[PDB]
Design a protein around this ligand. Structure first.
Ligand SMILES: C[C@@H](c1cccc2c(-c3ccc(CS(C)(=O)=O)c(F)c3)c(C(=O)O)[nH]c12)N1CC(CN2CC(C)(N)C2)OC1=O
Ligand SMILES: [Zn+2]
Ligand SMILES: [Zn+2]
Length: 232
């Protein structure tokens, strides 16, 4: 009823949307992994009379429910999707998207890692993002590669019209104690990549993590703090 949704407010197999700003929503879904339940976020950005989707809802059935919730709450067609790294919470559901007519995109690094690991593979390669600090425009957003952090391929997304910074899994929520799933992370490089984000987007008003509650710019410094602590 207005609060940011958690696993405890999202019915089973369900997706919820949350209005972040004019023409900007996050999507929230729940998934089980190795016997524990986790929330995860993605982004929806209005693109004229179409929508740009950032990240799947972590699974085929969750992503089908995401498309149904978008039709219910927004009613504009999702025409393109970007996955911000290769893990299942970002690409799981790309096959559903592709079969619904959505053009799916990711960096060549993400596509290679997804293919190697047996995850679903976005169709189109996003060039111009292979060097740390690189940025490219994609519809109503800017895509930014900050360097290795949560994964070597992780991208962040900025919505300039609303100063919304979607950090993906390279950014953690304020309540977080540890650095999440670090299986593919570069803990030594992560603080430097977060510094790049801070330097590039100092006017960000809302910061959205890959999992958990959005907040302000404080999420960036907090993420660096928890990552250095985990590393130590
Ligand atoms: C599918 C993904 C995955 C699954 C389950 C949980 C997470 C979490 C996570 C965990 C805890 C917290 C609370 S907290 C910050 O601690 O307070 C949290 F907010 C996020 C993250 C993340 O943090 O982004 N990602 C997760 N996976 C899988 C994976 C394993 N790897 C792939 C392989 C073969 N390549 C082996 O690595 C990954 O990221
Ligand atoms: Zn991940
Ligand atoms: Zn994640």
């Amino acid at each position: 009823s207005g609060e940011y949704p958690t696993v405890n407010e999202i019915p089973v197999g369900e997706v919820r949307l949350y209005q972040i700003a004019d023409g900007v929503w996050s999507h929230i879904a729940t998934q089980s992994f190795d016997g524990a339940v986790y929330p995860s976020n993605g982004l929806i950005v209005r693109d004229g009379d179409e929508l740009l989707l950032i990240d799947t809802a972590w699974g085929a059935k969750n992503t089908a429910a995401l498309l149904a919730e978008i039709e219910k709450q927004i009613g504009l067609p999702v025409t393109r999707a970007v996955s911000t790294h290769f893990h299942d919470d970002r690409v799981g559901g790309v096959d559903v998207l592709r079969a619904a007519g959505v053009a799916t995109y990711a960096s060549p690094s993400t596509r290679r890692l997804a293919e190697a690991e047996g995850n679903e593979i976005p169709t189109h390669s996003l060039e111009g993002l292979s060097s740390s600090g690189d940025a490219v425009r994609f519809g109503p957003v800017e895509l930014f590669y900050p360097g290795a952090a949560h994964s070597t391929d992780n991208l962040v997304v900025y919505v300039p019209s609303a100063n919304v910074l979607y950090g993906g899994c390279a950014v953690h929520e304020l309540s977080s104690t540890s650095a999440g799933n670090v299986a593919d992370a570069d803990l030594a490089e992560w603080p430097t990549s977060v510094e790049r984000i801070q330097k590039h987007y100092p006017e960000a008003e809302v910061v959205i993590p890959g999992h958990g509650l959005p907040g302000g710019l404080d999420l960036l410094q907090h993420t660096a703090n928890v990552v250095k602590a985990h590393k130590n």
